[PDB]
């Protein structure tokens, strides 16, 4: 019923900032809330972040902390994750969730097929 | 547990700049403030600075005041200190020392202290 | 820095006469601005503070108008103690720069 | 913010709707009443406080709240009805070089009771040394400024808050808001009413 | 504040109320209907005391009991004002009524009221030291051979001042006189005493001719005759006498 | 602003005696003002008498202060191994701050 | 409300420093901005230096760097200002201005009857 | 933040009504056209349960 698209791959300079699209069809999009994951390519899955454009609350984790920005869109229903000051770490998977009002919240329902971005020379 | 961490040494040139930082845990550190002094290898200690760490406000020696700064992060709980205009004089331990606290009363003079940078400036 | 003009420099009025000096700056100073008059060979004194607060104790008359880079001061019923130096006084950014200073005398 | 302004309201008609058209984007959290439904139900005396505050702080102005001003400039009790307005302030409040005409309170011995006021100046002893007024170790001054420029962030740049509290007091209502008027009709069976006349 | 022992000291003299003292109940019109309200008013042929100021002067603390109907013949406006409240001192709230040369100004504050308050051109307000609490303002207009005769109704009730006002130009005289409401008041304080305010012209200071009375009220039944205009026109006392209670 | 001279430059004990430090000031300095340090070679120094006359949490009684006037003394009323390092003595006052020349105990 | 007394005239050689007292009595001490404004005999006036002595931020003007300081005391509740390396362009009368708080620092609320200032040889 | 309710309607609710209406509130004369800016409230709110 409802499916999540989520952009490329990016290959980004570790001085730079990476933007990541997700696009949700399907359903009403007001009650709709949209969690980012990030998974290591060898280790599990890491939460940052969940946003509730209903309500326009937003939330990050401790230590993505004024570095990570989570928006939504409601003319084209999407999200957008900014990440600035880029590492060599942050070389991971990043997931776009997105949860139901009648489900719970801070749960995910659907998940995207993820983008890899890299941190290189 | 009370403990202050620092950074490892570091090797620089002339005319460049140097950055350290030592951390803070195990404490009230909102409270707190850290001094900065600097020892050669067999030579008695000097005062260079101090900042209070909810306030800014910085005093800095005679000497060292038009080339030394102080810059703290509270979501980093870490004291941060930067001299310009390296020497070959320069090359000497850098130590950061905070008083203890418990959010109530804070203890009277830098009883704990950090383990120390050596740096050296050469060409 | 900040360069300011006060115009027009010399202004000739009579007791009981309506008169406005305007002061304009180079850029933007928002609407921090102080004015000051000046008796000859006596200390300034301050009336109109943020181009409209107007200082306790100076009277009601004097009313200042303006937004940005363009300020003035009018003076509804003029009186012969209202003869002197007019200075400016921008204070947004440093380096606070005052006017050339306008002086009001009686028409001979 | 820390010597905030009290204004007592008493005799007179409130409009709020002029309250709307301060900012075209500006938070009107309310607790206890619906702002919408403010023109009808009314109470006897109005107190408004206004002072200004940083932008990320705005939150701690809120019954339950906790934090730098919440507990040390302004505290706000739990059972309390009213509504709060804060709007940006930027154009009004900042200087290039930096302003310094705002001040709060960083330390003090315990926290701050609802509606309670600290304007002491006394030297904060935080260790045991006295220092007996000497900005030393363990010796700093409650004030700070807030070094407003307008080059700042959202998150730094002033809000100017003002905070309406009401109650209800045995004496009558005195402030409250206007009433309706439907023109005349004559020679016609109409329902009507004359200040509660039915 | 000022201290004075030139009083003469004379017992208040008593007279005769007669039929004076009715006022509107309340704000609905009625013609030629015969109506009966039971209400506060003053009963008829009933004591109603007498000061006299003059070197007379009478400046008592009087009590407010349920209700007054303060009536005074004067000129040239002697009378100004008066005070009410519980000790008529800084440690209750105090009202304050008073018309000086400009207009009418009613306080709620709490004064720190003289021994011995008046009114001395007329530029020496000698009525109280100092104002901590006030918690209520308002300016209206002036309410003003003898010719004045003034007459006035207060009545607090549920936490409401009323006040009810007559003038009429001419012992007190004999005939029929409505009152009309005046000011309405939500002041909200219990008071149970009162004190008057008089005007003296410095020559130190002389005081002219003036009488006034006092009378309380206590409920009754009345049975009013309204005209067909809604004017009063008289009144029957039903407890006063058996032919009036047949009426 | 504030001069701190220390002497004697070394110091020749054995264990088992008692010691004394003396690090004498040269204007006058409060004496909740004041702090005595302690290094061992190569090793952060830490703190060891505040206030001229209190010790430190974990500082073995050994050591006791006597916090005279503006010339301030700690003597050390026991010697262990550990004592043998070198010493300095920092002023709190608003001026400047100094640090002493250093006594080395053999 | 608070009166405001400077120094008496100064006459001296331009090859050494002038120190300039100011003396500000009423109303409480801590809430008070002191301003020094140079008046020339042949022109208006100019701003040098600016002093918060409770919160302690000097601010001096661009051409008068390293040749002035501003410094107050609690204690005698007073203002100073020292002007070293003195040219013969630098004789003027100097005026001592304060700021209060409630309002305005960086305006002057009261000024000084002045002090004048002459170097020559 | 999964249990609201409604705080903003234009008229009273008829017994055992239910009204799950998402629509922008206008409670002033301008229309308020799909935002929820000046003078328009978005009728629901969170009961922020702690
Ligand atoms: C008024 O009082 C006097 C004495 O107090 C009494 O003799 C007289 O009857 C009273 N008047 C009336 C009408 O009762
Ligand atoms: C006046 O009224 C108050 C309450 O309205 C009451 O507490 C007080 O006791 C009263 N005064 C006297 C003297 O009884
Ligand atoms: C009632 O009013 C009318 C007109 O105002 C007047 O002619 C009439 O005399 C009045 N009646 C009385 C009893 O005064």
């Not at chain 5, 000086?100 to 001395?120: G, Y």
């Not at chain 6, 010493?87 to 640090?99: A, E, I, L």
Request: net charge positive; glycine share 8%.
């Amino acid at each position: 019923q409802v499916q999540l698209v989520q952009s490329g791959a990016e290959v980004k300079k570790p001085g730079s900032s990476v933007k990541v699209s997700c696009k949700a069809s399907g359903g009403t999009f007001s009650s709709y809330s949209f969690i980012w994951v990030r998974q290591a390519p060898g280790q599990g899955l890491e939460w940052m972040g969940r946003i509730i454009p209903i309500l326009g609350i937003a939330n990050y984790a401790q230590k993505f902390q004024g570095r990570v920005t989570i928006t939504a869109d409601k003319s084209t229903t999407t999200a957008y994750m900014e990440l600035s000051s880029l590492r060599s770490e942050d070389t991971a998977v990043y997931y776009c969730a997105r949860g139901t009002e009648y489900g719970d919240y801070d749960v995910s329902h659907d998940w995207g097929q993820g983008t890899l971005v890299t941190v290189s020379s | 547990q009370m403990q202050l961490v620092q950074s490892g040494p570091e090797v620089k040139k002339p005319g460049t700049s140097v950055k350290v930082s030592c951390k803070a845990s195990g404490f009230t550190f909102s409270s707190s403030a850290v001094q900065w002094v600097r020892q050669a290898r067999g030579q008695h200690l000097e005062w260079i600075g101090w900042i209070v760490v909810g306030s800014g406000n910085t005093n800095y020696a005679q000497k060292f005041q038009e080339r030394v700064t102080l810059t703290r992060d509270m979501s980093t709980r870490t004291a941060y200190m930067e001299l310009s205009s390296l020497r070959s004089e320069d090359t000497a331990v850098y130590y950061c020392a905070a008083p203890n606290c418990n959010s109530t009363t804070c203890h009277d003079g830098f009883d704990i202290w950090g383990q120390g940078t050596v740096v050296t400036v050469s060409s | 820095d900040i360069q300011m003009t006060q115009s027009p420099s010399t202004l000739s009025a009579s007791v009981g006469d309506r008169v406005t000096i305007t002061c304009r700056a180079s850029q933007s100073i928002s609407s921090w601005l102080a004015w000051y008059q000046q008796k000859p060979g006596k200390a300034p004194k301050l009336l109109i503070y943020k181009a409209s607060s107007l200082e306790s104790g100076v009277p009601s008359r004097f009313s200042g108008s303006g937004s940005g880079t363009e300020f003035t001061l009018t003076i509804s019923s003029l009186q012969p103690d209202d003869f002197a130096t007019y200075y400016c006084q921008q204070y947004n950014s440093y380096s606070h720069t005052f006017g050339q200073g306008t002086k009001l005398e009686i028409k001979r | 913010v820390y010597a905030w302004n009290r204004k007592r309201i008493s005799n007179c008609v409130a409009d709020y709707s002029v309250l709307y058209n301060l900012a075209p984007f500006f938070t009107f959290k309310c607790y206890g009443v619906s702002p919408t439904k403010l023109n009808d139900l009314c109470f006897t005396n109005v107190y408004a406080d206004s002072f200004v505050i940083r932008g990320d702080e705005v939150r701690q102005i809120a019954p339950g709240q906790t934090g730098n001003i919440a507990d040390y400039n302004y505290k706000l009790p739990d059972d309390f009805t009213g509504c709060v307005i804060a709007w940006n302030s930027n154009k009004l409040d900042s200087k290039v070089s930096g302003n310094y005409n705002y001040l709060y309170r960083l330390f003090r011995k315990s926290n701050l009771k609802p509606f309670e006021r600290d304007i002491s100046t006394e030297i904060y002893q935080a260790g045991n040394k006295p220092c007996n007024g000497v900005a030393g170790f363990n010796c700093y001054f409650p004030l700070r400024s807030y070094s407003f420029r307008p080059t700042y962030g959202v998150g730094h740049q002033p809000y100017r808050v003002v905070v309406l509290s009401f109650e209800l007091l045995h004496a009558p209502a005195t402030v409250c808001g206007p009433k309706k008027s439907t023109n005349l009709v004559k020679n016609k069976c109409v329902n009507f009413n004359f200040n509660g006349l039915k | 504040c000022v201290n004075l022992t030139t009083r003469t000291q004379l017992p208040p003299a008593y007279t005769n109320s007669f039929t004076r003292g009715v006022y509107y109940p309340d704000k609905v019109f009625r013609s030629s209907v015969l109506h009966s309200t039971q209400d506060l008013f003053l009963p008829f042929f009933s004591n109603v005391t007498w000061f006299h100021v003059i070197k007379r002067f009478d400046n008592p603390v009087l009590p407010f009991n349920d209700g007054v109907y303060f009536a005074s013949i004067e000129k040239s406006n002697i009378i100004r004002g008066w005070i009410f409240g519980t000790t008529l001192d800084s440690k209750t709230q105090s009202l304050l009524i008073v018309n000086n040369a400009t207009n009418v100004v009613i306080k709620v504050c709490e004064f720190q009221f003289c021994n011995d308050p008046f009114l001395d051109m007329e530029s020496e307000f000698r009525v109280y030291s100092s104002a901590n609490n006030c918690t209520f303002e308002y300016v209206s207009q002036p309410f003003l051979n003898f010719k004045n005769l003034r007459e006035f109704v207060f009545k607090n009730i549920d936490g409401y001042f009323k006040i009810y006002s007559k003038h009429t130009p001419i012992d007190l005289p004999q005939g029929f006189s409505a009152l009309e409401p005046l000011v309405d008041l939500p002041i909200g304080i219990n008071i149970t005493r009162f004190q008057t305010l008089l005007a003296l012209h410095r020559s130190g200071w002389t005081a002219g001719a003036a009488a006034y009375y006092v009378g309380y009220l206590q409920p009754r039944t009345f049975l009013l005759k309204y005209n067909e205009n809604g004017t009063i026109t008289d009144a029957v006392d039903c407890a006063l006498d058996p032919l009036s209670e047949t009426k | 602003e504030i001069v701190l001279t220390q002497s004697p430059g070394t110091l020749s004990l054995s264990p088992g005696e008692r010691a004394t430090l003396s690090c004498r000031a040269s204007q006058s300095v409060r004496s909740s003002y004041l702090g005595w340090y302690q290094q061992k070679p190569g090793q952060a120094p830490r703190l060891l008498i505040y206030g001229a006359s209190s010790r430190a949490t974990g500082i073995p009684d050994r050591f006791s202060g006597s916090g005279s006037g503006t010339d301030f003394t700690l003597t050390i009323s026991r010697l262990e191994s550990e004592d043998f390092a070198v010493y300095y003595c920092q002023q709190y006052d608003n001026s400047p701050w100094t640090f002493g020349q250093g006594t080395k105990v053999e």
